[PDB]
Amino acid sequence: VLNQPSSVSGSLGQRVSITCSGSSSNVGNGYVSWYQLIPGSAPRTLIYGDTSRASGVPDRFSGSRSGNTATLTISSLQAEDEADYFCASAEDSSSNAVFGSGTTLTVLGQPKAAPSVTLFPPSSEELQANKATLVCLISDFYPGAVTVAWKADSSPVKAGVETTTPSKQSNNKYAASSYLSLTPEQWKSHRSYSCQVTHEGSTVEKTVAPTECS
Amino acid sequence: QVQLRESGPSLVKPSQTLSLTCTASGFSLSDKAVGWVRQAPGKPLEWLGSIDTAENTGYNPGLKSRLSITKDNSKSQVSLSVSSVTTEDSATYYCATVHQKTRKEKNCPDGYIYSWICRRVGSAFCSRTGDYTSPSEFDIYEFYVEGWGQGLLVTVSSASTKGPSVFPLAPSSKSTSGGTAALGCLVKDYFPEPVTVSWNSGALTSGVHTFPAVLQSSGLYSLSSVVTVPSSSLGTQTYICNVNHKPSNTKVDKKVEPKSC
Protein backbone atom coordinates (compact mmCIF):
# COMPACT_ATOMS: atom_id res chain seq x y z
CA VAL A 1 0.00 0.00 0.00
CA LEU A 2 1.26 3.49 -0.81
CA ASN A 3 1.76 5.27 2.50
CA GLN A 4 -0.37 8.39 2.77
CA PRO A 5 -0.96 10.60 5.81
CA SER A 6 -3.92 9.20 7.73
CA SER A 7 -5.42 12.68 8.16
CA VAL A 8 -4.38 16.24 7.31
CA SER A 9 -6.05 19.58 7.96
CA GLY A 10 -6.19 22.94 6.23
CA SER A 11 -7.83 26.35 6.41
CA LEU A 12 -10.04 28.12 3.89
CA GLY A 13 -8.15 29.88 1.10
CA GLN A 14 -4.77 28.42 2.08
CA ARG A 15 -2.48 25.76 0.55
CA VAL A 16 -2.13 22.16 1.75
CA SER A 17 -0.09 19.17 0.62
CA ILE A 18 -0.51 15.40 0.88
CA THR A 19 2.31 12.86 0.49
CA CYS A 20 2.32 9.40 -1.10
CA SER A 21 5.28 7.18 -0.20
CA GLY A 22 5.91 3.90 -1.95
CA SER A 23 9.03 2.11 -3.18
CA SER A 24 11.25 1.99 -6.25
CA SER A 25 8.92 -0.62 -7.77
CA ASN A 26 5.70 1.45 -7.72
CA VAL A 27 6.20 5.17 -7.00
CA GLY A 28 9.85 4.89 -7.99
CA ASN A 29 8.70 3.70 -11.40
CA GLY A 30 6.66 6.88 -11.50
CA TYR A 31 3.37 7.82 -13.10
CA VAL A 32 1.29 8.62 -10.01
CA SER A 33 -2.45 9.29 -9.96
CA TRP A 34 -4.68 11.10 -7.45
CA TYR A 35 -8.42 10.59 -6.85
CA GLN A 36 -11.07 12.43 -4.82
CA LEU A 37 -13.84 10.56 -2.97
CA ILE A 38 -16.80 12.72 -1.96
CA PRO A 39 -19.15 10.89 0.47
CA GLY A 40 -22.03 9.66 -1.65
CA SER A 41 -20.68 10.26 -5.14
CA ALA A 42 -18.33 8.14 -7.19
CA PRO A 43 -14.56 8.76 -7.11
CA ARG A 44 -13.13 11.38 -9.44
CA THR A 45 -9.93 11.25 -11.47
CA LEU A 46 -7.76 14.19 -10.39
CA ILE A 47 -4.15 13.67 -11.47
CA TYR A 48 -2.35 11.28 -13.82
CA GLY A 49 1.28 10.88 -14.80
CA ASP A 50 2.62 12.56 -11.66
CA THR A 51 1.49 15.96 -12.92
CA SER A 52 -1.11 15.76 -15.69
CA ARG A 53 -4.38 17.39 -14.68
CA ALA A 54 -7.68 15.79 -15.62
CA SER A 55 -10.28 17.52 -17.76
CA GLY A 56 -12.39 19.97 -15.79
CA VAL A 57 -10.06 19.94 -12.77
CA PRO A 58 -9.11 23.49 -11.70
CA ASP A 59 -5.48 24.59 -11.73
CA ARG A 60 -5.42 24.79 -7.92
CA PHE A 61 -4.73 21.04 -7.86
CA SER A 62 -1.10 20.19 -8.61
CA GLY A 63 0.95 17.01 -8.48
CA SER A 64 4.65 16.33 -8.15
CA ARG A 65 7.02 13.48 -7.37
CA SER A 66 10.54 13.27 -5.97
CA GLY A 67 11.95 9.76 -6.04
CA ASN A 68 9.68 7.42 -4.10
CA THR A 69 7.37 10.19 -2.87
CA ALA A 70 4.61 12.06 -4.68
CA THR A 71 2.69 15.09 -3.46
CA LEU A 72 -0.72 16.59 -4.21
CA THR A 73 -1.01 20.30 -3.42
CA ILE A 74 -4.33 22.15 -3.25
CA SER A 75 -4.20 25.95 -3.25
CA SER A 76 -7.13 28.25 -2.55
CA LEU A 77 -8.65 25.51 -0.41
CA GLN A 78 -12.43 25.59 -0.81
CA ALA A 79 -15.26 24.03 1.19
CA GLU A 80 -16.02 21.44 -1.51
CA ASP A 81 -12.52 20.01 -0.90
CA GLU A 82 -13.54 18.26 2.34
CA ALA A 83 -13.11 14.66 1.20
CA ASP A 84 -10.83 11.62 1.16
CA TYR A 85 -7.86 11.55 -1.22
CA PHE A 86 -6.00 8.53 -2.64
CA CYS A 87 -2.87 7.97 -4.75
CA ALA A 88 -2.12 5.02 -7.04
CA SER A 89 0.83 3.70 -9.04
CA ALA A 90 1.47 0.58 -11.11
CA GLU A 91 3.96 -2.02 -9.93
CA ASP A 92 5.92 -4.43 -12.16
CA SER A 93 3.04 -4.34 -14.66
CA SER A 94 0.64 -1.80 -16.16
CA SER A 95 -2.17 -3.99 -14.76
CA ASN A 96 -1.04 -4.30 -11.11
CA ALA A 97 -2.20 -1.03 -9.53
CA VAL A 98 -1.29 -0.21 -5.93
CA PHE A 99 -3.35 2.33 -3.98
CA GLY A 100 -2.47 4.46 -0.96
CA SER A 101 -3.71 4.10 2.60
CA GLY A 102 -5.93 7.15 2.11
CA THR A 103 -6.07 10.59 3.69
CA THR A 104 -9.08 12.50 5.02
CA LEU A 105 -9.04 16.25 4.30
CA THR A 106 -10.69 18.62 6.79
CA VAL A 107 -11.46 22.25 5.90
CA LEU A 108 -11.53 24.65 8.86
CA GLY A 109 -12.75 28.20 9.32
CA GLN A 110 -16.49 27.74 8.82
CA PRO A 111 -19.08 29.61 10.91
CA LYS A 112 -20.00 27.76 14.07
CA ALA A 113 -23.60 26.78 14.69
CA ALA A 114 -25.53 25.23 17.51
CA PRO A 115 -27.52 22.05 16.89
CA SER A 116 -31.25 22.29 16.28
CA VAL A 117 -32.70 19.18 17.94
CA THR A 118 -36.01 17.48 17.15
CA LEU A 119 -37.24 14.51 19.18
CA PHE A 120 -39.98 12.30 17.77
CA PRO A 121 -41.88 9.83 19.95
CA PRO A 122 -43.04 6.39 18.76
CA SER A 123 -45.56 6.67 15.95
CA SER A 124 -49.05 5.31 16.53
CA GLU A 125 -48.45 2.74 13.79
CA GLU A 126 -45.23 1.51 15.37
CA LEU A 127 -46.91 1.21 18.77
CA GLN A 128 -49.75 -0.84 17.28
CA ALA A 129 -47.03 -3.15 15.92
CA ASN A 130 -45.78 -3.78 19.50
CA LYS A 131 -42.59 -1.76 18.90
CA ALA A 132 -41.35 1.60 20.17
CA THR A 133 -38.47 3.66 18.78
CA LEU A 134 -37.52 7.15 19.94
CA VAL A 135 -35.82 9.15 17.18
CA CYS A 136 -33.67 12.16 18.07
CA LEU A 137 -32.55 14.17 15.04
CA ILE A 138 -29.74 16.70 15.36
CA SER A 139 -29.21 19.21 12.57
CA ASP A 140 -27.25 22.24 11.44
CA PHE A 141 -24.23 22.43 13.71
CA TYR A 142 -20.52 23.15 13.35
CA PRO A 143 -18.11 21.86 14.60
CA GLY A 144 -19.34 18.30 14.26
CA ALA A 145 -18.45 17.08 17.76
CA VAL A 146 -21.68 16.34 19.62
CA THR A 147 -22.58 14.04 22.48
CA VAL A 148 -25.97 12.44 22.98
CA ALA A 149 -27.40 10.99 26.17
CA TRP A 150 -30.82 9.57 27.00
CA LYS A 151 -32.69 10.09 30.25
CA ALA A 152 -35.58 7.87 31.30
CA ASP A 153 -37.27 9.66 34.21
CA SER A 154 -34.10 11.65 34.92
CA SER A 155 -32.01 8.50 35.05
CA PRO A 156 -29.34 7.83 32.41
CA VAL A 157 -30.07 5.18 29.78
CA LYS A 158 -27.45 3.29 27.77
CA ALA A 159 -29.33 0.13 26.69
CA GLY A 160 -31.13 0.29 23.37
CA VAL A 161 -29.24 3.39 22.27
CA GLU A 162 -27.70 3.56 18.81
CA THR A 163 -26.16 6.79 17.55
CA THR A 164 -24.90 7.59 14.09
CA THR A 165 -21.63 9.33 13.43
CA PRO A 166 -22.11 12.96 12.35
CA SER A 167 -22.27 13.59 8.61
CA LYS A 168 -22.30 16.76 6.54
CA GLN A 169 -25.58 17.88 5.02
CA SER A 170 -26.16 19.63 1.70
CA ASN A 171 -25.79 23.01 3.43
CA ASN A 172 -22.37 21.77 4.71
CA LYS A 173 -23.49 21.73 8.36
CA TYR A 174 -23.34 18.52 10.33
CA ALA A 175 -26.18 16.22 11.33
CA ALA A 176 -26.51 13.11 13.46
CA SER A 177 -29.27 10.90 14.79
CA SER A 178 -29.86 8.68 17.79
CA TYR A 179 -32.49 5.99 18.30
CA LEU A 180 -33.79 4.42 21.50
CA SER A 181 -35.44 1.05 20.85
CA LEU A 182 -37.98 0.07 23.50
CA THR A 183 -40.83 -2.36 23.95
CA PRO A 184 -44.20 -0.64 24.54
CA GLU A 185 -44.07 -1.82 28.16
CA GLN A 186 -40.75 -0.04 28.75
CA TRP A 187 -42.07 3.08 26.98
CA LYS A 188 -45.04 3.31 29.36
CA SER A 189 -43.16 2.35 32.53
CA HIS A 190 -41.79 5.93 32.50
CA ARG A 191 -43.36 9.38 32.49
CA SER A 192 -40.80 11.14 30.31
CA TYR A 193 -37.68 10.57 28.22
CA SER A 194 -35.07 13.13 27.30
CA CYS A 195 -32.49 13.50 24.54
CA GLN A 196 -29.49 15.60 25.57
CA VAL A 197 -27.13 17.04 22.97
CA THR A 198 -23.87 18.51 24.30
CA HIS A 199 -22.11 20.80 21.81
CA GLU A 200 -19.62 23.49 22.87
CA GLY A 201 -20.43 23.10 26.55
CA SER A 202 -24.05 23.87 25.70
CA THR A 203 -26.64 21.10 26.07
CA VAL A 204 -29.86 21.11 24.08
CA GLU A 205 -32.35 18.72 25.68
CA LYS A 206 -35.70 17.70 24.22
CA THR A 207 -38.25 15.80 26.27
CA VAL A 208 -41.27 13.69 25.33
CA ALA A 209 -43.94 12.02 27.44
CA PRO A 210 -46.10 9.04 26.43
CA THR A 211 -49.21 10.56 28.02
CA GLU A 212 -49.02 13.66 25.82
CA CYS A 213 -49.04 13.93 22.04
CA SER A 214 -45.84 15.84 21.31
CA GLN B 1 -21.60 10.27 -22.54
CA VAL B 2 -19.25 7.59 -21.20
CA GLN B 3 -21.22 5.74 -18.51
CA LEU B 4 -20.38 2.50 -16.70
CA ARG B 5 -23.19 0.77 -14.81
CA GLU B 6 -22.73 -2.11 -12.38
CA SER B 7 -25.35 -4.83 -11.97
CA GLY B 8 -25.63 -7.86 -9.72
CA PRO B 9 -26.77 -9.21 -6.35
CA SER B 10 -26.69 -7.06 -3.22
CA LEU B 11 -26.26 -10.09 -0.93
CA VAL B 12 -24.18 -13.25 -1.24
CA LYS B 13 -23.68 -16.11 1.19
CA PRO B 14 -20.19 -17.15 2.31
CA SER B 15 -18.17 -19.69 0.32
CA GLN B 16 -20.25 -18.93 -2.77
CA THR B 17 -19.04 -16.99 -5.82
CA LEU B 18 -20.00 -13.37 -6.46
CA SER B 19 -20.67 -12.50 -10.11
CA LEU B 20 -21.08 -8.94 -11.39
CA THR B 21 -21.55 -7.29 -14.78
CA CYS B 22 -20.48 -3.87 -16.09
CA THR B 23 -22.64 -2.42 -18.86
CA ALA B 24 -21.00 0.28 -20.98
CA SER B 25 -22.55 3.25 -22.77
CA GLY B 26 -21.16 5.80 -25.22
CA PHE B 27 -17.81 4.16 -25.99
CA SER B 28 -16.82 0.91 -27.69
CA LEU B 29 -15.19 -1.83 -25.62
CA SER B 30 -12.88 -2.39 -28.61
CA ASP B 31 -11.27 0.99 -27.85
CA LYS B 32 -10.64 1.47 -24.12
CA ALA B 33 -9.53 -0.91 -21.39
CA VAL B 34 -11.76 -1.72 -18.42
CA GLY B 35 -10.99 -2.67 -14.83
CA TRP B 36 -12.64 -3.29 -11.47
CA VAL B 37 -11.96 -1.63 -8.10
CA ARG B 38 -13.47 -2.26 -4.66
CA GLN B 39 -13.44 -0.44 -1.32
CA ALA B 40 -14.43 -2.18 1.92
CA PRO B 41 -16.22 -0.19 4.67
CA GLY B 42 -13.69 2.25 6.03
CA LYS B 43 -10.89 0.57 4.08
CA PRO B 44 -8.64 1.91 1.30
CA LEU B 45 -9.26 1.29 -2.37
CA GLU B 46 -8.17 -2.14 -3.57
CA TRP B 47 -7.19 -3.08 -7.12
CA LEU B 48 -8.79 -6.17 -8.65
CA GLY B 49 -8.07 -6.56 -12.37
CA SER B 50 -8.32 -5.29 -15.92
CA ILE B 51 -8.94 -6.47 -19.49
CA ASP B 52 -7.55 -4.63 -22.52
CA THR B 53 -8.76 -4.36 -26.11
CA ALA B 54 -6.72 -7.53 -26.76
CA GLU B 55 -8.80 -9.36 -24.12
CA ASN B 56 -5.59 -9.85 -22.12
CA THR B 57 -6.16 -9.96 -18.36
CA GLY B 58 -4.01 -8.77 -15.48
CA TYR B 59 -5.04 -9.17 -11.86
CA ASN B 60 -4.06 -8.15 -8.36
CA PRO B 61 -1.53 -10.84 -7.32
CA GLY B 62 -3.00 -11.50 -3.88
CA LEU B 63 -6.40 -12.10 -5.48
CA LYS B 64 -5.46 -13.72 -8.82
CA SER B 65 -6.45 -17.17 -7.54
CA ARG B 66 -10.05 -16.03 -7.00
CA LEU B 67 -10.61 -13.57 -9.86
CA SER B 68 -11.84 -13.97 -13.42
CA ILE B 69 -12.56 -11.20 -15.92
CA THR B 70 -14.31 -11.61 -19.28
CA LYS B 71 -15.53 -9.30 -22.03
CA ASP B 72 -18.23 -9.36 -24.71
CA ASN B 73 -17.75 -6.76 -27.45
CA SER B 74 -21.22 -7.27 -28.93
CA LYS B 75 -23.23 -6.71 -25.74
CA SER B 76 -20.70 -4.05 -24.65
CA GLN B 77 -20.31 -5.70 -21.25
CA VAL B 78 -17.56 -6.84 -18.91
CA SER B 79 -18.13 -9.51 -16.25
CA LEU B 80 -16.23 -10.08 -13.00
CA SER B 81 -16.27 -13.14 -10.74
CA VAL B 82 -14.90 -13.72 -7.23
CA SER B 83 -14.70 -17.18 -5.68
CA SER B 84 -15.11 -18.47 -2.12
CA VAL B 85 -16.36 -15.16 -0.76
CA THR B 86 -16.12 -14.21 2.92
CA THR B 87 -17.36 -11.31 5.01
CA GLU B 88 -14.05 -9.58 4.22
CA ASP B 89 -15.28 -9.45 0.60
CA SER B 90 -18.19 -7.22 1.60
CA ALA B 91 -17.63 -3.88 -0.12
CA THR B 92 -18.62 -1.44 -2.85
CA TYR B 93 -17.58 -2.45 -6.37
CA TYR B 94 -16.90 -0.10 -9.30
CA CYS B 95 -15.96 -0.73 -12.94
CA ALA B 96 -13.95 1.88 -14.80
CA THR B 97 -12.27 2.80 -18.06
CA VAL B 98 -8.53 2.61 -17.44
CA HIS B 99 -5.39 3.76 -19.21
CA GLN B 100 -2.50 1.28 -19.30
CA LYS B 101 0.82 1.62 -21.11
CA THR B 102 4.38 0.40 -20.55
CA ARG B 103 7.10 2.92 -21.42
CA LYS B 104 10.46 1.30 -22.25
CA GLU B 105 12.93 4.00 -21.25
CA LYS B 106 16.64 3.15 -21.46
CA ASN B 107 19.43 4.27 -19.13
CA CYS B 108 23.12 4.64 -19.97
CA PRO B 109 26.16 4.48 -17.64
CA ASP B 110 27.99 7.63 -16.56
CA GLY B 111 29.76 9.47 -19.36
CA TYR B 112 27.60 7.97 -22.12
CA ILE B 113 24.53 8.93 -24.12
CA TYR B 114 22.06 7.03 -26.29
CA SER B 115 23.24 7.19 -29.94
CA TRP B 116 21.61 2.77 -31.41
CA ILE B 117 23.85 2.24 -28.38
CA CYS B 118 25.26 4.17 -25.42
CA ARG B 119 28.29 6.03 -26.81
CA ARG B 120 30.87 8.13 -24.97
CA VAL B 121 30.44 11.86 -25.49
CA GLY B 122 33.31 12.95 -27.71
CA SER B 123 34.03 9.45 -29.01
CA ALA B 124 34.47 10.43 -32.68
CA PHE B 125 34.57 6.76 -33.76
CA CYS B 126 31.54 4.54 -34.30
CA SER B 127 33.07 1.20 -33.27
CA ARG B 128 35.99 2.16 -31.02
CA THR B 129 36.46 -0.28 -28.14
CA GLY B 130 35.71 1.84 -25.08
CA ASP B 131 33.47 4.40 -26.80
CA TYR B 132 30.20 2.44 -26.69
CA THR B 133 28.10 0.39 -24.24
CA SER B 134 24.90 -1.67 -24.16
CA PRO B 135 21.89 0.41 -23.05
CA SER B 136 19.92 -1.08 -20.17
CA GLU B 137 16.16 -0.57 -20.39
CA PHE B 138 13.87 0.52 -17.56
CA ASP B 139 10.18 -0.24 -17.97
CA ILE B 140 7.92 2.54 -16.65
CA TYR B 141 4.44 1.09 -16.07
CA GLU B 142 1.64 3.60 -16.64
CA PHE B 143 -1.75 3.25 -14.96
CA TYR B 144 -4.65 5.55 -14.18
CA VAL B 145 -8.44 5.36 -14.09
CA GLU B 146 -10.08 7.34 -16.88
CA GLY B 147 -13.74 7.14 -15.89
CA TRP B 148 -15.77 5.73 -13.01
CA GLY B 149 -19.22 4.22 -12.58
CA GLN B 150 -21.66 4.69 -9.74
CA GLY B 151 -20.77 1.67 -7.66
CA LEU B 152 -22.75 -1.31 -6.37
CA LEU B 153 -22.80 -2.32 -2.71
CA VAL B 154 -22.25 -6.04 -2.10
CA THR B 155 -22.78 -7.70 1.29
CA VAL B 156 -21.46 -11.13 2.33
CA SER B 157 -23.48 -12.70 5.13
CA SER B 158 -25.33 -15.89 6.05
CA ALA B 159 -28.34 -13.87 7.26
CA SER B 160 -31.37 -13.48 5.02
CA THR B 161 -32.83 -10.44 3.28
CA LYS B 162 -35.57 -8.47 5.01
CA GLY B 163 -37.78 -5.67 3.74
CA PRO B 164 -38.19 -2.42 5.67
CA SER B 165 -40.99 -1.15 7.89
CA VAL B 166 -41.77 2.53 7.29
CA PHE B 167 -43.20 4.55 10.19
CA PRO B 168 -44.06 8.27 10.15
CA LEU B 169 -42.41 11.06 12.14
CA ALA B 170 -45.14 13.67 12.08
CA PRO B 171 -44.85 17.23 13.41
CA SER B 172 -47.09 18.03 16.36
CA SER B 173 -48.22 21.43 17.60
CA LYS B 174 -45.32 21.46 20.09
CA SER B 175 -42.68 20.41 17.56
CA THR B 176 -43.02 23.35 15.21
CA SER B 177 -40.49 26.17 15.06
CA GLY B 178 -42.69 29.04 13.95
CA GLY B 179 -43.01 29.30 10.19
CA THR B 180 -41.16 25.99 9.79
CA ALA B 181 -41.73 22.38 10.83
CA ALA B 182 -39.81 19.10 10.62
CA LEU B 183 -41.45 15.84 9.46
CA GLY B 184 -39.99 12.56 8.29
CA CYS B 185 -40.12 8.79 7.93
CA LEU B 186 -38.52 5.99 9.95
CA VAL B 187 -37.25 3.05 7.86
CA LYS B 188 -37.07 0.28 10.44
CA ASP B 189 -35.50 -3.17 10.45
CA TYR B 190 -34.17 -3.92 6.97
CA PHE B 191 -31.26 -5.91 5.52
CA PRO B 192 -29.00 -5.58 3.67
CA GLU B 193 -28.23 -2.05 2.55
CA PRO B 194 -28.90 0.01 0.59
CA VAL B 195 -32.09 1.94 1.20
CA THR B 196 -32.88 5.18 -0.62
CA VAL B 197 -35.60 7.67 0.27
CA SER B 198 -37.15 10.49 -1.74
CA TRP B 199 -40.05 12.79 -0.90
CA ASN B 200 -43.16 13.49 -2.99
CA SER B 201 -41.57 11.62 -5.91
CA GLY B 202 -38.55 13.92 -5.86
CA ALA B 203 -40.65 17.04 -6.44
CA LEU B 204 -39.77 18.06 -2.85
CA THR B 205 -36.00 18.53 -2.57
CA SER B 206 -35.78 21.67 -0.39
CA GLY B 207 -34.47 20.81 3.05
CA VAL B 208 -34.45 17.03 2.71
CA HIS B 209 -31.76 15.10 4.54
CA THR B 210 -31.62 11.32 4.88
CA PHE B 211 -29.53 10.12 7.78
CA PRO B 212 -27.00 7.29 7.73
CA ALA B 213 -28.28 3.94 8.91
CA VAL B 214 -27.46 2.32 12.23
CA LEU B 215 -26.88 -1.41 12.64
CA GLN B 216 -28.75 -2.61 15.73
CA SER B 217 -27.80 -5.70 17.74
CA SER B 218 -30.33 -7.71 15.72
CA GLY B 219 -28.05 -7.40 12.69
CA LEU B 220 -30.58 -5.21 10.87
CA TYR B 221 -30.29 -1.61 9.71
CA SER B 222 -32.49 1.38 10.53
CA LEU B 223 -32.42 4.78 8.85
CA SER B 224 -34.31 8.06 8.92
CA SER B 225 -35.08 10.82 6.44
CA VAL B 226 -36.51 14.23 7.33
CA VAL B 227 -37.67 17.32 5.45
CA THR B 228 -38.21 20.91 6.60
CA VAL B 229 -41.50 22.38 5.41
CA PRO B 230 -43.44 25.61 5.94
CA SER B 231 -45.69 25.34 8.98
CA SER B 232 -48.26 27.27 6.94
CA SER B 233 -48.55 24.36 4.50
CA LEU B 234 -49.09 21.63 7.11
CA GLY B 235 -52.72 20.62 6.67
CA THR B 236 -52.87 21.88 3.07
CA GLN B 237 -50.04 20.34 1.07
CA THR B 238 -49.63 16.58 1.43
CA TYR B 239 -46.26 15.02 2.20
CA ILE B 240 -45.30 11.47 1.24
CA CYS B 241 -41.96 9.71 1.62
CA ASN B 242 -41.00 7.24 -1.12
CA VAL B 243 -38.78 4.51 0.33
CA ASN B 244 -36.86 2.13 -1.94
CA HIS B 245 -35.15 -1.12 -0.83
CA LYS B 246 -33.92 -2.85 -4.02
CA PRO B 247 -32.24 -5.67 -2.01
CA SER B 248 -35.80 -6.94 -1.57
CA ASN B 249 -37.40 -5.22 -4.61
CA THR B 250 -39.64 -3.19 -2.30
CA LYS B 251 -41.05 0.31 -2.66
CA VAL B 252 -43.15 1.98 0.05
CA ASP B 253 -44.93 5.33 -0.25
CA LYS B 254 -45.82 6.42 3.29
CA LYS B 255 -47.94 9.53 3.78
CA VAL B 256 -46.73 11.61 6.74
CA GLU B 257 -49.75 13.57 8.08
CA PRO B 258 -49.43 16.23 10.80
CA LYS B 259 -50.29 15.12 14.32
CA SER B 260 -53.61 16.61 15.41
CA CYS B 261 -52.50 18.03 18.77
In short:
The complex is a heterodimer of chains A (214) and B (261). Chain A is mainly β.
Q: What portion of residues of chain A is helical?
A: under 10%
Q: Count all strands of chain A and give the number.
A: 19
**What share of the residues of chain A does DSSP label as strand, in percent?**
over 45%
Report the sheet with the most strands of chain A, covering strand number, pairing sense and barrel closure: 7 strands, mixed
Looking at CATH, which topology of the largest domain in chain B would you report?
Immunoglobulin-like
Find the structural class of chain B using helix and strand composition.
mainly beta
Supply the number of structural domains of chain A.
2
Number of strands of chain B: 22
CATH class wording of the largest domain in chain B: Mainly Beta
Question: What structural class do you assign from the helix and strand content of chain A?
Answer: mainly beta
Q: What are the secondary-structure elements of chain A, in order, as H or E?
A: EEEEEEEEEEEHEEEEEEHEE
* Terminal-residue CA separation of chain A: 53 Å
The ordered H/E elements of chain B are EEEEEEEEEEEEEEEEEEEEEE
How much strand of chain B?
over 45%
CATH superfamily of the largest domain in chain A: Immunoglobulins
Radius of gyration of chain A: 24 Å
Biggest interface and which pair forms it?
Answer: A-B, 55 and 57 residues
CATH domain class name of the largest domain in chain A: Mainly Beta
Domain Ig-like (chain B): 164-257
Subcellular location (chain B): Secreted; Cell membrane
Disulfide bonds (chain B): 185-241
Protein name (chain B): Immunoglobulin gamma-1 heavy chain
What does this structure look like?
- The complex is a heterodimer of chains A (214) and B (261).
- Chain A is mostly beta strands.
- Chain A folds into 2 domains: 7-108, Immunoglobulins (Immunoglobulin-like, Sandwich); 116-208, Immunoglobulins (Immunoglobulin-like), CATH 2.60.40.10.
- Chain A is built from 2 helices and 19 strands.
- In chain A, strands 1, 3, 4, 5, 8, 9 and 10 form a 7-stranded mixed β-sheet that branches. In chain A, strands 11, 12, 15, 16 and 17 form a 5-stranded antiparallel β-sheet that branches.
- In chain A, strand 6 (61-66) and strand 7 (69-74) form a beta hairpin.
- The longest helix of chain A is centred in the middle third of the chain and has 5 residues, at 124-128.
- Chain A is elongated.
- The termini of chain A are far apart.
- By secondary structure, chain B is mostly beta strands.
- Chain B has 2 domains: 3-103 and 138-156, Immunoglobulin-like (Sandwich), CATH 2.60.40; 165-255, Sandwich (Immunoglobulin-like).
- In chain B, 0% of the residues lie in helices and 51% in strands.
- Chain B has no helices and 22 strands.
- In chain B, strands 2, 4, 5, 6, 9, 13 and 14 form a 7-stranded mixed β-sheet that branches. In chain B, strands 15, 16, 18, 19 and 20 form a 5-stranded antiparallel β-sheet that branches.
- Chain B starts with a strand and ends in a 6-residue tail after the last strand.
- Classes of the chains: A mainly beta (214), B mainly beta (261).
- Chains A and B meet through strand 4, strand 8, strand 9, strand 11 and strand 12 of A and strand 5, strand 6, strand 9, strand 13 and strand 15 of B.
- Chain A: Pfam families: C1-set.
- Chain A: Disulfide bonds join 136-195.
- Chain A: Keywords: Adaptive immunity, Bence-Jones protein, Cell membrane, Disulfide bond, Immunity, Immunoglobulin, Immunoglobulin domain, Membrane, Secreted.
- Chain A: It comes from Homo sapiens.
- Chain A: GO terms for molecular function: antigen binding.
- Chain B: It comes from Homo sapiens.
